[PDB]
mmCIF file of C-alpha atoms and ligand atoms in Angstrom:
data_model
loop_
_atom_site.group_PDB
_atom_site.id
_atom_site.type_symbol
_atom_site.label_atom_id
_atom_site.label_comp_id
_atom_site.label_asym_id
_atom_site.label_seq_id
_atom_site.Cartn_x
_atom_site.Cartn_y
_atom_site.Cartn_z
ATOM 1 C CA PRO K 1 0.010 -0.027 -0.021
ATOM 2 C CA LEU K 2 1.303 3.329 -1.168
ATOM 3 C CA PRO K 3 3.372 4.853 0.405
ATOM 4 C CA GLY K 4 4.811 1.673 1.664
ATOM 5 C CA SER K 5 8.026 2.683 3.636
ATOM 6 C CA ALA K 6 8.825 2.468 7.320
ATOM 7 C CA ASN K 7 11.233 4.527 9.459
ATOM 8 C CA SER K 8 13.405 3.171 12.291
ATOM 9 C CA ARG K 9 14.421 4.367 15.849
ATOM 10 C CA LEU K 10 18.034 4.396 16.957
ATOM 11 C CA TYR K 11 18.848 4.242 20.635
ATOM 12 C CA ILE K 12 22.363 4.853 22.172
ATOM 13 C CA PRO K 13 22.480 3.765 25.854
ATOM 14 C CA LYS K 14 25.866 5.268 26.314
ATOM 15 C CA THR K 15 24.816 8.772 25.570
ATOM 16 C CA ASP K 16 21.253 8.199 26.753
ATOM 17 C CA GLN K 17 19.961 9.450 23.388
ATOM 18 C CA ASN K 18 17.477 8.152 20.734
ATOM 19 C CA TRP K 19 15.852 9.344 17.393
ATOM 20 C CA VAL K 20 13.577 8.487 14.644
ATOM 21 C CA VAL K 21 15.921 7.944 11.742
ATOM 22 C CA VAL K 22 14.420 9.457 8.646
ATOM 23 C CA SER K 23 15.295 8.284 5.105
ATOM 24 C CA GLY K 24 18.042 10.190 3.175
ATOM 25 C CA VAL K 25 21.070 12.203 4.142
ATOM 26 C CA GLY K 26 20.428 15.463 2.317
ATOM 27 C CA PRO K 27 20.403 18.744 4.350
ATOM 28 C CA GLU K 28 16.724 18.838 4.692
ATOM 29 C CA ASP K 29 16.665 15.128 5.609
ATOM 30 C CA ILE K 30 18.969 15.516 8.592
ATOM 31 C CA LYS K 31 18.064 19.061 9.642
ATOM 32 C CA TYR K 32 16.659 17.913 12.955
ATOM 33 C CA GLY K 33 18.183 14.444 13.476
ATOM 34 C CA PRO K 34 19.883 11.492 11.801
ATOM 35 C CA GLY K 35 19.065 9.952 8.545
ATOM 36 C CA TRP K 36 19.783 6.706 6.674
ATOM 37 C CA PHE K 37 21.779 6.399 3.571
ATOM 38 C CA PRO K 38 19.236 4.860 1.049
ATOM 39 C CA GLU K 39 21.987 3.475 -1.074
ATOM 40 C CA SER K 40 25.374 1.710 -0.130
ATOM 41 C CA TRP K 41 28.522 2.157 -2.270
ATOM 42 C CA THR K 42 30.200 -0.569 -4.437
ATOM 43 C CA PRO K 43 33.074 -0.261 -6.994
ATOM 44 C CA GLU K 44 30.421 -1.119 -9.596
ATOM 45 C CA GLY K 45 27.916 1.560 -8.472
ATOM 46 C CA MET K 46 25.417 2.348 -5.776
ATOM 47 C CA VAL K 47 22.988 -0.535 -4.564
ATOM 48 C CA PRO K 48 19.915 -0.318 -2.233
ATOM 49 C CA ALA K 49 21.338 -0.171 1.356
ATOM 50 C CA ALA K 50 20.411 -2.682 4.146
ATOM 51 C CA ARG K 51 17.093 -2.024 6.017
ATOM 52 C CA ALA K 52 17.325 -2.190 9.755
ATOM 53 C CA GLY K 53 18.812 -5.389 11.175
ATOM 54 C CA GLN K 54 19.437 -6.752 7.591
ATOM 55 C CA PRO K 55 22.630 -8.149 5.989
ATOM 56 C CA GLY K 56 24.681 -5.173 4.678
ATOM 57 C CA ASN K 57 25.332 -1.824 6.072
ATOM 58 C CA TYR K 58 22.686 0.452 7.635
ATOM 59 C CA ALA K 59 24.495 3.598 7.602
ATOM 60 C CA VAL K 60 23.332 6.905 9.262
ATOM 61 C CA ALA K 61 24.499 10.488 8.971
ATOM 62 C CA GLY K 62 24.033 13.065 11.777
ATOM 63 C CA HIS K 63 25.207 16.470 12.404
ATOM 64 C CA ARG K 64 27.890 17.038 15.162
ATOM 65 C CA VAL K 65 25.555 18.954 17.459
ATOM 66 C CA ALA K 66 24.220 18.687 20.881
ATOM 67 C CA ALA K 67 20.924 17.111 20.030
ATOM 68 C CA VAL K 68 22.375 14.579 17.626
ATOM 69 C CA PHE K 69 25.959 13.265 17.222
ATOM 70 C CA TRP K 70 28.152 15.500 19.356
ATOM 71 C CA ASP K 71 28.973 12.748 21.814
ATOM 72 C CA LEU K 72 29.618 9.827 19.219
ATOM 73 C CA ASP K 73 33.326 10.030 20.242
ATOM 74 C CA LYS K 74 32.235 8.666 23.589
ATOM 75 C CA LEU K 75 31.344 5.292 21.993
ATOM 76 C CA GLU K 76 33.943 2.376 22.500
ATOM 77 C CA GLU K 77 34.169 -1.034 21.249
ATOM 78 C CA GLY K 78 31.660 -3.288 22.924
ATOM 79 C CA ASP K 79 29.050 -0.484 23.394
ATOM 80 C CA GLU K 80 25.452 -1.400 22.284
ATOM 81 C CA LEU K 81 23.472 0.545 19.727
ATOM 82 C CA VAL K 82 19.839 -0.436 19.153
ATOM 83 C CA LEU K 83 17.906 -0.130 16.004
ATOM 84 C CA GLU K 84 14.103 -0.538 16.124
ATOM 85 C CA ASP K 85 11.783 -1.403 13.034
ATOM 86 C CA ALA K 86 8.223 -2.392 13.120
ATOM 87 C CA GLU K 87 8.920 -5.839 14.319
ATOM 88 C CA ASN K 88 12.209 -6.116 16.209
ATOM 89 C CA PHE K 89 14.844 -4.524 18.281
ATOM 90 C CA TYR K 90 18.244 -5.052 16.809
ATOM 91 C CA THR K 91 21.209 -4.689 19.101
ATOM 92 C CA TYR K 92 24.559 -3.997 17.491
ATOM 93 C CA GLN K 93 27.858 -3.854 19.255
ATOM 94 C CA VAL K 94 30.492 -1.390 18.312
ATOM 95 C CA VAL K 95 33.637 -3.005 16.628
ATOM 96 C CA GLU K 96 35.354 0.062 15.349
ATOM 97 C CA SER K 97 35.642 3.815 15.758
ATOM 98 C CA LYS K 98 37.804 5.799 13.411
ATOM 99 C CA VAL K 99 38.284 9.030 11.618
ATOM 100 C CA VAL K 100 38.413 9.260 7.750
ATOM 101 C CA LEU K 101 38.364 11.977 5.051
ATOM 102 C CA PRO K 102 35.136 13.292 3.694
ATOM 103 C CA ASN K 103 35.464 11.422 0.412
ATOM 104 C CA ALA K 104 35.809 7.897 2.195
ATOM 105 C CA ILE K 105 32.495 6.755 0.642
ATOM 106 C CA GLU K 106 33.739 3.128 1.335
ATOM 107 C CA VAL K 107 32.477 3.470 4.908
ATOM 108 C CA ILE K 108 29.002 3.033 3.607
ATOM 109 C CA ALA K 109 29.684 -0.036 1.403
ATOM 110 C CA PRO K 110 27.574 -3.151 2.211
ATOM 111 C CA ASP K 111 30.512 -4.612 4.010
ATOM 112 C CA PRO K 112 32.649 -1.645 5.245
ATOM 113 C CA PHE K 113 35.502 -4.106 6.151
ATOM 114 C CA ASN K 114 35.489 -5.313 2.565
ATOM 115 C CA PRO K 115 34.326 -2.345 0.468
ATOM 116 C CA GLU K 116 35.649 -3.796 -2.939
ATOM 117 C CA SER K 117 33.405 -6.811 -2.591
ATOM 118 C CA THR K 118 30.640 -7.183 -5.325
ATOM 119 C CA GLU K 119 29.021 -10.109 -3.493
ATOM 120 C CA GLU K 120 25.808 -10.122 -1.463
ATOM 121 C CA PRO K 121 26.646 -9.131 2.154
ATOM 122 C CA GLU K 122 26.144 -11.753 4.728
ATOM 123 C CA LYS K 123 26.700 -9.860 8.066
ATOM 124 C CA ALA K 124 24.596 -7.000 9.309
ATOM 125 C CA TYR K 125 26.424 -3.960 10.281
ATOM 126 C CA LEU K 126 25.220 -0.475 11.508
ATOM 127 C CA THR K 127 27.502 2.568 10.758
ATOM 128 C CA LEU K 128 27.028 6.004 12.336
ATOM 129 C CA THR K 129 28.665 9.102 10.539
ATOM 130 C CA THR K 130 29.303 12.620 11.659
ATOM 131 C CA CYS K 131 31.745 15.594 11.187
ATOM 132 C CA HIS K 132 35.025 15.579 12.870
ATOM 133 C CA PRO K 133 36.780 17.104 14.772
ATOM 134 C CA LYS K 134 34.348 19.029 16.783
ATOM 135 C CA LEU K 135 33.371 22.396 15.221
ATOM 136 C CA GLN K 136 35.273 21.337 11.920
ATOM 137 C CA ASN K 137 34.204 19.385 8.944
ATOM 138 C CA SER K 138 37.574 18.297 7.637
ATOM 139 C CA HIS K 139 37.098 14.622 8.554
ATOM 140 C CA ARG K 140 34.360 12.207 9.517
ATOM 141 C CA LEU K 141 33.909 10.064 12.681
ATOM 142 C CA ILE K 142 32.788 6.880 11.799
ATOM 143 C CA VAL K 143 31.330 4.101 14.224
ATOM 144 C CA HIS K 144 30.849 0.680 12.810
ATOM 145 C CA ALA K 145 28.789 -1.917 14.839
ATOM 146 C CA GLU K 146 27.884 -5.530 14.115
ATOM 147 C CA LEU K 147 24.325 -7.280 14.761
ATOM 148 C CA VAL K 148 24.562 -9.403 17.985
ATOM 149 C CA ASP K 149 20.876 -9.804 18.891
ATOM 150 C CA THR K 150 17.384 -9.654 17.201
ATOM 151 C CA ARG K 151 14.581 -9.251 19.831
ATOM 152 C CA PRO K 152 10.891 -9.413 18.677
ATOM 153 C CA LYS K 153 8.939 -6.376 20.028
ATOM 154 C CA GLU K 154 6.362 -8.770 21.489
ATOM 155 C CA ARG K 155 9.113 -9.464 24.316
ATOM 156 C CA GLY K 156 9.160 -5.684 25.083
ATOM 157 C CA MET K 157 12.027 -3.234 25.092
ATOM 158 C CA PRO K 158 15.504 -4.190 26.195
ATOM 159 C CA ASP K 159 16.233 -3.114 29.800
ATOM 160 C CA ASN K 160 18.963 -0.777 28.766
ATOM 161 C CA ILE K 161 16.583 1.383 26.700
ATOM 162 C CA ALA K 162 13.276 0.862 28.335
ATOM 163 C CA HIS K 163 13.230 4.435 29.774
ATOM 164 C CA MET K 164 13.684 6.143 26.506
ATOM 165 C CA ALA K 165 10.073 6.964 25.850
ATOM 166 C CA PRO K 166 8.521 8.426 22.752
ATOM 167 C CA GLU K 167 6.240 11.588 22.787
ATOM 168 C CA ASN K 168 3.531 10.087 20.667
ATOM 169 C CA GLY K 169 4.608 5.795 14.216
ATOM 170 C CA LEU K 170 7.375 3.884 12.344
ATOM 171 C CA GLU K 171 4.728 2.697 9.800
ATOM 172 C CA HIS K 172 1.762 4.343 8.058
ATOM 173 C CA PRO W 1 32.030 14.068 0.120
ATOM 174 C CA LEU W 2 29.888 12.313 2.844
ATOM 175 C CA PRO W 3 26.944 12.781 3.092
ATOM 176 C CA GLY W 4 26.685 13.525 -0.574
ATOM 177 C CA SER W 5 22.874 13.940 -1.133
ATOM 178 C CA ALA W 6 20.718 16.938 -2.303
ATOM 179 C CA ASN W 7 17.122 17.769 -1.777
ATOM 180 C CA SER W 8 14.795 19.452 -4.166
ATOM 181 C CA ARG W 9 12.067 22.117 -4.012
ATOM 182 C CA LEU W 10 8.630 21.717 -5.377
ATOM 183 C CA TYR W 11 6.472 24.741 -6.552
ATOM 184 C CA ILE W 12 2.886 24.588 -7.705
ATOM 185 C CA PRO W 13 1.713 28.043 -9.075
ATOM 186 C CA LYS W 14 -1.927 26.943 -9.122
ATOM 187 C CA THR W 15 -2.150 26.384 -5.448
ATOM 188 C CA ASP W 16 0.476 29.004 -4.526
ATOM 189 C CA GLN W 17 2.588 26.544 -2.581
ATOM 190 C CA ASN W 18 6.044 25.273 -2.358
ATOM 191 C CA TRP W 19 8.182 22.887 -0.150
ATOM 192 C CA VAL W 20 11.447 21.316 0.168
ATOM 193 C CA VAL W 21 10.905 17.753 -0.755
ATOM 194 C CA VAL W 22 12.714 15.279 1.615
ATOM 195 C CA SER W 23 13.823 11.818 0.590
ATOM 196 C CA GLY W 24 11.749 8.925 1.500
ATOM 197 C CA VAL W 25 8.002 8.424 2.147
ATOM 198 C CA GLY W 26 8.063 6.897 5.590
ATOM 199 C CA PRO W 27 5.720 8.577 8.241
ATOM 200 C CA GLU W 28 8.611 10.383 9.806
ATOM 201 C CA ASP W 29 9.728 11.474 6.343
ATOM 202 C CA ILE W 30 6.535 13.194 5.255
ATOM 203 C CA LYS W 31 5.279 14.250 8.719
ATOM 204 C CA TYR W 32 5.718 17.924 7.661
ATOM 205 C CA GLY W 33 5.722 18.042 3.739
ATOM 206 C CA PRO W 34 6.267 15.963 0.706
ATOM 207 C CA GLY W 35 8.804 13.231 0.160
ATOM 208 C CA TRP W 36 10.391 11.571 -2.823
ATOM 209 C CA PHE W 37 10.084 7.752 -3.439
ATOM 210 C CA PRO W 38 13.677 6.580 -3.533
ATOM 211 C CA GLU W 39 12.885 3.510 -5.720
ATOM 212 C CA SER W 40 10.364 3.141 -8.866
ATOM 213 C CA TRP W 41 8.563 -0.122 -9.401
ATOM 214 C CA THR W 42 8.988 -2.481 -12.217
ATOM 215 C CA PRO W 43 7.610 -5.911 -12.764
ATOM 216 C CA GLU W 44 11.201 -7.358 -12.286
ATOM 217 C CA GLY W 45 11.611 -5.551 -8.936
ATOM 218 C CA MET W 46 12.265 -2.056 -7.441
ATOM 219 C CA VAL W 47 14.909 0.243 -9.231
ATOM 220 C CA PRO W 48 16.399 3.586 -8.382
ATOM 221 C CA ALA W 49 13.978 6.373 -8.915
ATOM 222 C CA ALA W 50 14.639 9.463 -11.287
ATOM 223 C CA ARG W 51 16.284 12.472 -9.638
ATOM 224 C CA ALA W 52 14.785 15.797 -10.348
ATOM 225 C CA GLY W 53 14.415 16.695 -14.029
ATOM 226 C CA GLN W 54 15.726 13.149 -15.201
ATOM 227 C CA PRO W 55 14.359 10.390 -17.418
ATOM 228 C CA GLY W 56 12.084 8.206 -15.234
ATOM 229 C CA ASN W 57 9.401 9.124 -12.670
ATOM 230 C CA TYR W 58 10.149 11.517 -9.795
ATOM 231 C CA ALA W 59 7.420 10.528 -7.531
ATOM 232 C CA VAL W 60 6.339 12.422 -4.425
ATOM 233 C CA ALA W 61 3.945 11.467 -1.442
ATOM 234 C CA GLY W 62 2.318 14.122 0.692
ATOM 235 C CA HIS W 63 -0.477 14.028 3.347
ATOM 236 C CA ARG W 64 -3.839 15.313 2.222
ATOM 237 C CA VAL W 65 -3.823 18.338 4.650
ATOM 238 C CA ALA W 66 -3.869 22.071 4.454
ATOM 239 C CA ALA W 67 -0.127 22.702 4.508
ATOM 240 C CA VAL W 68 0.477 19.994 1.853
ATOM 241 C CA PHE W 69 -1.541 18.196 -0.709
ATOM 242 C CA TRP W 70 -5.120 18.959 0.157
ATOM 243 C CA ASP W 71 -5.793 21.101 -2.939
ATOM 244 C CA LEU W 72 -3.994 18.625 -5.434
ATOM 245 C CA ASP W 73 -7.397 17.997 -6.891
ATOM 246 C CA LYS W 74 -7.443 21.491 -8.270
ATOM 247 C CA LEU W 75 -4.583 20.712 -10.705
ATOM 248 C CA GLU W 76 -5.822 20.213 -14.408
ATOM 249 C CA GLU W 77 -4.105 19.149 -17.652
ATOM 250 C CA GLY W 78 -1.700 21.911 -18.691
ATOM 251 C CA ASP W 79 -1.040 23.277 -15.251
ATOM 252 C CA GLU W 80 2.649 23.753 -14.444
ATOM 253 C CA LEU W 81 4.749 22.218 -11.499
ATOM 254 C CA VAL W 82 8.329 23.196 -10.986
ATOM 255 C CA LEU W 83 10.964 21.056 -9.368
ATOM 256 C CA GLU W 84 14.230 22.680 -8.408
ATOM 257 C CA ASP W 85 17.628 20.947 -7.765
ATOM 258 C CA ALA W 86 21.027 22.467 -7.168
ATOM 259 C CA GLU W 87 21.453 23.493 -10.925
ATOM 260 C CA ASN W 88 18.038 23.862 -12.559
ATOM 261 C CA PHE W 89 14.397 24.570 -12.512
ATOM 262 C CA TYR W 90 12.458 21.792 -14.348
ATOM 263 C CA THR W 91 8.938 22.780 -15.365
ATOM 264 C CA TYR W 92 6.490 19.780 -15.711
ATOM 265 C CA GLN W 93 2.928 20.131 -17.112
ATOM 266 C CA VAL W 94 0.221 18.107 -15.867
ATOM 267 C CA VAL W 95 -0.826 15.414 -18.441
ATOM 268 C CA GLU W 96 -3.237 13.386 -16.120
ATOM 269 C CA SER W 97 -4.949 13.331 -12.664
ATOM 270 C CA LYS W 98 -6.715 10.076 -11.648
ATOM 271 C CA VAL W 99 -7.745 8.014 -8.578
ATOM 272 C CA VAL W 100 -6.249 4.616 -7.927
ATOM 273 C CA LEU W 101 -6.415 1.976 -5.117
ATOM 274 C CA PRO W 102 -3.638 2.041 -2.479
ATOM 275 C CA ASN W 103 -1.908 -1.068 -3.987
ATOM 276 C CA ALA W 104 -1.664 0.610 -7.648
ATOM 277 C CA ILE W 105 2.217 0.674 -7.294
ATOM 278 C CA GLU W 106 2.386 1.110 -11.080
ATOM 279 C CA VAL W 107 1.912 4.748 -10.703
ATOM 280 C CA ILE W 108 5.614 4.997 -9.514
ATOM 281 C CA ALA W 109 6.840 2.927 -12.449
ATOM 282 C CA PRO W 110 9.629 4.697 -14.418
ATOM 283 C CA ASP W 111 7.234 5.163 -17.174
ATOM 284 C CA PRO W 112 3.607 5.264 -15.501
ATOM 285 C CA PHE W 113 2.035 5.052 -19.000
ATOM 286 C CA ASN W 114 3.935 1.890 -19.636
ATOM 287 C CA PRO W 115 4.432 0.399 -16.262
ATOM 288 C CA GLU W 116 5.173 -3.242 -17.503
ATOM 289 C CA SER W 117 8.293 -1.895 -19.607
ATOM 290 C CA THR W 118 11.564 -3.101 -18.239
ATOM 291 C CA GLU W 119 13.402 -0.825 -20.769
ATOM 292 C CA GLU W 120 15.112 2.313 -19.733
ATOM 293 C CA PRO W 121 12.879 5.397 -19.532
ATOM 294 C CA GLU W 122 13.417 8.040 -21.951
ATOM 295 C CA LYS W 123 10.764 10.576 -20.760
ATOM 296 C CA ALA W 124 11.069 12.643 -17.601
ATOM 297 C CA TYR W 125 7.938 12.459 -15.539
ATOM 298 C CA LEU W 126 6.897 14.070 -12.166
ATOM 299 C CA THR W 127 4.193 12.241 -10.133
ATOM 300 C CA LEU W 128 2.367 13.802 -7.088
ATOM 301 C CA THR W 129 0.443 11.287 -4.738
ATOM 302 C CA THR W 130 -1.886 11.800 -1.831
ATOM 303 C CA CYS W 131 -4.727 10.144 -0.043
ATOM 304 C CA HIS W 132 -8.173 10.364 -1.429
ATOM 305 C CA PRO W 133 -11.021 11.279 -1.063
ATOM 306 C CA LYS W 134 -10.524 14.048 1.393
ATOM 307 C CA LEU W 135 -10.720 12.812 5.050
ATOM 308 C CA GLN W 136 -10.412 9.265 3.827
ATOM 309 C CA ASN W 137 -7.429 7.018 2.917
ATOM 310 C CA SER W 138 -9.326 4.432 0.741
ATOM 311 C CA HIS W 139 -7.657 5.558 -2.364
ATOM 312 C CA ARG W 140 -4.929 7.594 -3.836
ATOM 313 C CA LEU W 141 -5.023 10.792 -5.907
ATOM 314 C CA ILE W 142 -2.307 10.765 -8.605
ATOM 315 C CA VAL W 143 -1.087 13.644 -10.679
ATOM 316 C CA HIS W 144 1.299 12.933 -13.565
ATOM 317 C CA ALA W 145 3.157 15.523 -15.405
ATOM 318 C CA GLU W 146 5.728 15.634 -18.127
ATOM 319 C CA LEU W 147 8.924 17.650 -18.375
ATOM 320 C CA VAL W 148 8.485 20.631 -20.772
ATOM 321 C CA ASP W 149 11.396 22.910 -19.808
ATOM 322 C CA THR W 150 14.833 22.992 -18.104
ATOM 323 C CA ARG W 151 16.118 26.484 -17.023
ATOM 324 C CA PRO W 152 19.462 26.762 -15.277
ATOM 325 C CA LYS W 153 19.520 28.645 -11.973
ATOM 326 C CA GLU W 154 22.003 31.126 -13.475
ATOM 327 C CA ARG W 155 19.027 32.708 -15.395
ATOM 328 C CA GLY W 156 16.971 33.115 -12.256
ATOM 329 C CA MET W 157 13.480 31.873 -11.245
ATOM 330 C CA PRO W 158 10.522 31.450 -13.776
ATOM 331 C CA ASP W 159 8.209 34.331 -13.439
ATOM 332 C CA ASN W 160 5.270 32.196 -12.226
ATOM 333 C CA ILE W 161 7.149 31.100 -9.110
ATOM 334 C CA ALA W 162 9.582 34.161 -8.416
ATOM 335 C CA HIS W 163 7.446 35.401 -5.460
ATOM 336 C CA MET W 164 7.988 32.075 -3.624
ATOM 337 C CA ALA W 165 10.785 33.076 -1.319
ATOM 338 C CA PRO W 166 12.461 30.626 1.128
ATOM 339 C CA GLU W 167 13.281 31.545 4.824
ATOM 340 C CA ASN W 168 16.950 30.401 4.644
ATOM 341 C CA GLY W 169 20.254 24.856 1.396
ATOM 342 C CA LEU W 170 19.385 21.974 -1.123
ATOM 343 C CA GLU W 171 23.068 20.849 -0.847
ATOM 344 C CA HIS W 172 25.474 20.462 2.075
HETATM 345 CL CL1 CL F 1 37.292 16.947 18.712
HETATM 346 CL CL1 CL F 2 -12.663 14.359 -2.065
HETATM 347 NA NA1 NA F 3 15.966 11.951 12.192
HETATM 348 NA NA1 NA F 4 13.304 12.646 5.261
HETATM 349 NA NA1 NA F 5 8.954 17.844 2.768
#
């Protein structure tokens, strides 16, 4: 049924933050919070990006600002990030944080640890991207995380995010 | 340079309205205004949708509400719609308005007048979609329009939309 798309929610226990993640990473898309790159990069051209929890690379851009990704540098290996779709909570664990140049489009490849691959991805990653350093845009801070758990919503919210209440729709 | 994406602006002389069109048509995407379907439908599966002004079908969803697409039914054959990207104003002219069921995904095919084609589109269309009737969501009101003019922004705005000023970025 038109329009058919869903949004997701992102939760970060470590910074005590969460958002509805919109589609797209244009200036109007991420004006007020994080957005999902709709396409992943490959050497042979752009392909549809992974949806939440799915094999590939669910990549997100957000401004380096108080209400969004200012504190992304506080994430360390092992930290949990939770992505929520209409059916599940997906827990990812941070496996890497690094700094790259603005043109390092490889970080949004379906497998960011093998960006030259042309094969279908098998692992599910989550990537968070923002400007770096603070108050500069010379570089990008990148956090990659790997799926460790899929929890159907029928079982309720994970304890570490259960206090992060909405104000009022992921689906039409 | 990450993130690399641009948004567009849509202008409708007839209803004296304009918006920044976001990416995506999820509930959070189109909460406040129209959004672009990132993929077009074909019988063989979803493909990347046309960008503004480009061959294919630039399709937009917006709620049937005062600040968005309430008055889309006022558009008639011949009426102009303007889509603006970073470089050009694209004028489209309405060729058809019709009502379809919610599952008529063909309206977002690259060529909505030949939805079963799997060949590359050659014509540039703009499609506006909203709920129909007024105060119901049983159907969809669809306006299809065809590209008639490409004006580079260096030449300034078309006369019929030159009074539609912003408050403030289509690109990062
Ligand atoms: Cl810093
Ligand atoms: Cl009506
Ligand atoms: Na957001
Ligand atoms: Na959006
Ligand atoms: Na909009």
